Symmetry: C2
Subunit: 211 residues, 2 copies
């Protein structure tokens, strides 16, 4: 695979160019649903640019997206709201605070954003985490996925070492970031059930990917 031959800088470079744009919004449910739908179209294009992803069968690509799509939207939102304490930046024209807040998810999203802030999470680290979520949430195929995940781990470590972190600080920060993903999974699952009152089907995601 070409993904397995990528260096850390190349992995970072690839993920950075694959970044979807920050979309604008056009009731709260309507605006967010409209935003989420348009975001999903970009997520498909982004996923197909994640190194090692298209090497998977179309069936495996769908399953990964079906499991991780809300986590990816959420970590995006959290990343966007990082420099706006006490507020969620769904869109540049849709900045919501706690009072406008569902409130349980809101607080957890706020807590994740504040966590990214105190860790001063970098954009290079962020795109690494986002692709990790894609490949891990729904995980020869499983073997290949785990190899790519090792690459992203090596990529994360290289970024930290280049930033001047000691070997100890490197495994600690690596641990801190990956444990945040556990909280992201939790927010996603709670969001899913609160959503059932709307979700991308297997067939829908397969059709979008085939474009």
């Amino acid at each position: 695979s070409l993904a397995l031959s990528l260096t850390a800088d190349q992995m970072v470079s690839a993920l950075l160019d694959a970044e979807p744009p920050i979309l604008y919004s056009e009731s709260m449910m309507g605006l967010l649903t409209n935003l989420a739908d348009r975001e999903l179209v970009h997520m498909i294009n982004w996923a197909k640019r994640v190194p090692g992803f298209v090497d998977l069968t179309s069936h495996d690509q769908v399953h990964l997206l079906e499991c991780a799509w809300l986590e990816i939207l959420m970590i995006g939102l959290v990343w966007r709201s990082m420099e706006h304490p006490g507020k969620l930046l769904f869109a540049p024209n849709l900045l919501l605070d706690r009072n406008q807040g569902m409130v349980e998810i809101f607080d957890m999203l706020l807590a994740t954003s504040s966590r990214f802030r105190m860790m001063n999470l970098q954009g290079e680290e962020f795109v690494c985490l986002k692709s990790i979520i894609l490949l891990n949430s729904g995980v020869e195929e499983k073997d290949h996925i785990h190899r790519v995940l090792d690459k992203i781990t090596d990529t994360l470590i290289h970024l930290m070492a280049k930033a001047g972190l000691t070997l100890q600080q490197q495994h600690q920060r690596l641990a801190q970031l990956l444990l945040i993903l556990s909280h992201i999974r939790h927010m996603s699952n709670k969001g899913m059930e609160h959503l059932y009152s709307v979700v991308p089907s297997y067939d829908l995601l397969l059709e979008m990917l085939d474009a």
Copy 2:
């Protein structure tokens, strides 16, 4: 002082703090019904929650927290902790879940069963060690509920979490793994915790469900 222990002392403390393996109610009516099954699992979990409290209070740094914060962490992690314990017990039993030594069940509800099976085979594949297991379980306890905690208490937990990370890496280096393999294995282990969170959430949704704040507090003060 938890933050003063060495890596070997951390492992030693975690191993000594391990809860015992419990049996489900002896001689239940077989085969099972959906009710009688859940009746046995509920009974087993309720008896396990008691020993988990004892284990929790022996986890380095946990008793340093206020009772309120201790309850919160347990309120968030208790099902995760029961599940990773289940997955650990089931490692040497391919295609089976070992809820109890007298309660070994195969696939033949089913979605969670499959998820637990996959995780167990994942542990078996990685050759997960006991010293690594108790570290992961301690991480779950301290991490699952940390994300809504005063600032000195949240900072303290992260230091203990950093300590267990050091302990994991120390175990891997001591075993002979290269620095790259150490990073990779550490990552693979913590990513599984995300799956465990997922299984816990699916299980939760599946009159007395939550352990209740008051019960957990009472068991803690005792």
